[PDB]
Ras-related C3 botulinum toxin substrate 1
Amino acid sequence: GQAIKCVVVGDGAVGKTCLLISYTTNAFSGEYIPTVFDNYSANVMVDGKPVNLGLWDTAGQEDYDRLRPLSYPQTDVFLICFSLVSPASFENVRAKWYPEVRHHCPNTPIILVGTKLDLRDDKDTIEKLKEKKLTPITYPQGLAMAKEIGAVKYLECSALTQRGLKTVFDEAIRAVL
Ligand SMILES: Nc1nc2c(ncn2[C@@H]2O[C@H](COP(=O)(O)OP(=O)(O)NP(=O)(O)O)[C@@H](O)[C@H]2O)c(=O)[nH]1
Ligand SMILES: [Mg+2]
């Protein structure tokens, strides 16, 4: 029944594509193949209602900055994604993604999505960020970023384990219905 265009943006290698592949097909590959542009689809049921969810997977890489806004018109909801184990990808939520999205789409709801949850509390990945004086992004920190960018929701997920995965898209839909 209801068509909903959801566009997915965020830094190169945060897990945009994996998130969408894991959700639509239940697969996960460890291999990194940088997106140019891809389209996904899902027929979902949310709070009683049938939804045709269109999923626009954009290129995270800087080289695509002039092309990426071509995808923006008519968007119903954005997911702005960052990796929970990349503080730099997190800063870019506010330094790059929020301003870019808002530049072309002043009113479209934003869901902030922290990705790679399976690594956030991983004892080992913590010590390995600690060398570079880095710390994974915690839940309240993510919450505070969502408020800072006026996001409708803050959600955390893992494409690998699928923890928090369905909610991301339920809530993307709920922000539109
Ligand atoms: N441990 C873990 N790795 C993940 C997860 N999601 C993605 N990755 C890994 O992170 C890398 C980048 O994934 P990808 O989905 O391609 O990122 P992207 O945001 O789509 N990149 P691009 O903007 O360049 O298209 C891959 O090696 C992938 O296997 C996750 O939930 N957990
Ligand atoms: Mg990709």
Notes: Residues 36 and 63 are 10 Å apart (CA to CA). The radius of gyration is 15 Å. Helices lie at 16-25, 87-104, 117-120, 123-130, 139-148, 165-174.
